[PDB]
């Protein structure tokens, strides 16, 4: 009893668009990490600054689970020191990242014949995101030298781009659900612990 709600994150019915990524604060609970592994045959499971198997013996102040959907091709960008549309404009991991990145193919759930257009990403931006920044602004992007005045049109684009996930797409272009676990140890009592 009093187990950390990993199901609420991993088994969520709908996931967020990478630009509008969701975060879940896990605190004041027992984290049974052994389930995560015995859960699904996760296509990706990389850890940084931790062994996944050591997590049952560790105690953290806070744990953060960040979920979103991207293409299989872009999963390689959910790592420190990476570049690409996602790393630069959507979800940025710091160089000193301490946690795990878990991804799995969700073509059956998230792609639809004719396209699943709920899943978006930021295609345009004036600068790159700082690690863990989250940009939700749907302000018109000025591609030309002349200003937009907030009005969409020629040389003035809406910043977000849809993926339109279809099941017939290649494995690289299919939707992948991603959960980035971040472990935080602060100068406060550690409340999130593994089972003995």
């Amino acid at each position, epitope marked *: 009893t009093n187990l950390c709600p990993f199901g609420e994150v991993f088994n969520a019915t709908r996931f967020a668009s990478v630009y509008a990524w969701n975060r879940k604060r896990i605190s004041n609970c027992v984290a049974d990490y052994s389930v995560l592994y015995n859960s699904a045959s996760f296509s990706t499971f990389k850890c940084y600054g931790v062994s996944p198997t050591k997590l049952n013996d560790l105690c953290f102040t806070n744990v953060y689970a960040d979920s979103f959907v991207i293409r299989g091709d872009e999963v390689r960008q959910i790592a420190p020191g990476q570049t690409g549309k996602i790393a630069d404009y959507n979800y940025k991991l710091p160089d000193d990242f301490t946690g795990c990145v878990i991804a799995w193919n969700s073509n059956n759930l998230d792609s639809k014949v*004719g396209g699943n257009y709920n899943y978006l990403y930021r295609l345009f931006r004036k600068s790159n995101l700082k690690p863990f920044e989250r940009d939700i602004s749907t302000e018109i992007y000025q591609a030309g030298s002349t200003p937009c005045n907030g009005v969409e049109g020629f040389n003035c684009y809406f910043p977000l781009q849809s993926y339109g996930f279809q*099941p017939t797409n290649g494995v690289g272009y299919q939707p992948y659900r991603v959960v980035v676990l971040s472990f935080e140890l602060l100068h406060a009592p550690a409340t999130v612990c593994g089972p003995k």
Partner: antibody, heavy 121, light 111 residues
Framework: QVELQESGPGLVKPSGTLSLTCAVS?????????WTWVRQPPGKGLEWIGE???????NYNPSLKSRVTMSVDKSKNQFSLNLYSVTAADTAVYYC??????????????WGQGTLVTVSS | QAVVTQPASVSGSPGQSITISCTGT?????????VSWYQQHPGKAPKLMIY???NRPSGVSNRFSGSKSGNTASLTISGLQAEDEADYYC??????????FGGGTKVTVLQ
């Protein structure tokens, strides 16, 4: 608010063509919403006909795929349905509705009042 | 497409609580958490009451509960009021990227 109003002939001759148009009000049809048609024969249950997105995507009941087409008129702000080779079985109240989102089925929020279409000689 | 079966009729008494079942396949109800229930009053368009198995839209009475077990969805109406007398239709996404409706259930409140 978002309002849907079906339009179209009430009578279609057997082996003719049913053509309806749903007129979207209080919301652009260019929204990320799968604009769908659902029918209901008198006193019988509901049957999903198909859907269409502004991008041009379509998806239709496997049962009626071979004789159904839908379209989007962005300038008029309306979506359409064409049911070719109609039979008495196709006599039903035709509802134009929309998915709460433009992804996998998430439930239909807004509906039209329905248009009865009587297929008779 | 797929056959999604619901009980033809479900009867209750005012204040009572009733449950409508919606049994289907693994290519529909049991494979996706995309189930929706509709309430249809005579001569009117269906009303969305529950979406994605359990979520109720803004303005729907909290007396409408949505749940699912395996290949079976269940709409539960607690504290029945006569205005609940209607036809209830479940629905689900399918592996074929299509939507399928249930047979319908005539819910009757004693009068």
């Amino acid at each position: 608010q978002v309002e849907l109003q079906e339009s179209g002939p009430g009578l279609v001759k057997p082996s003719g063509t049913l053509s309806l148009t749903c007129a979207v009000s209080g919301g652009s049809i260019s929204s990320n919403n799968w604009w769908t048609w659902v029918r209901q024969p008198p006193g019988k249950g509901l049957e999903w006909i198909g859907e269409i997105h502004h991008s041009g995507g379509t998806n239709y009941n496997p049962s009626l795929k071979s004789r159904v087409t839908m379209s989007v008129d962005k300038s008029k702000n309306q979506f359409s349905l064409n049911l070719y080779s109609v039979t008495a079985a196709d006599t039903a109240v035709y509802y134009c509705t929309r998915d709460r989102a433009g992804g996998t089925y998430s439930g239909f929020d807004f509906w039209g009042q329905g248009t009865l279409v009587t297929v008779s000689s | 497409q797929a056959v999604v079966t619901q009980p033809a009729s479900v009867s209750g008494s005012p204040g009572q609580s009733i449950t409508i079942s919606c049994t289907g396949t693994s290519s529909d109800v049991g494979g996706y958490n995309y189930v929706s229930w509709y309430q249809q009053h005579p001569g009117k368009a269906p009303k969305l009451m529950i979406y994605d198995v359990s979520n109720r839209p803004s303005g729907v009475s909290n007396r409408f509960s949505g749940s699912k077990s395996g290949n079976t969805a269940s709409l539960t109406i607690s504290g029945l009021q006569a205005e609940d007398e209607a036809d209830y239709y479940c629905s689900s996404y399918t592996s074929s990227s299509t939507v399928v409706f249930g047979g319908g259930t005539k819910v009757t409140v004693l009068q």
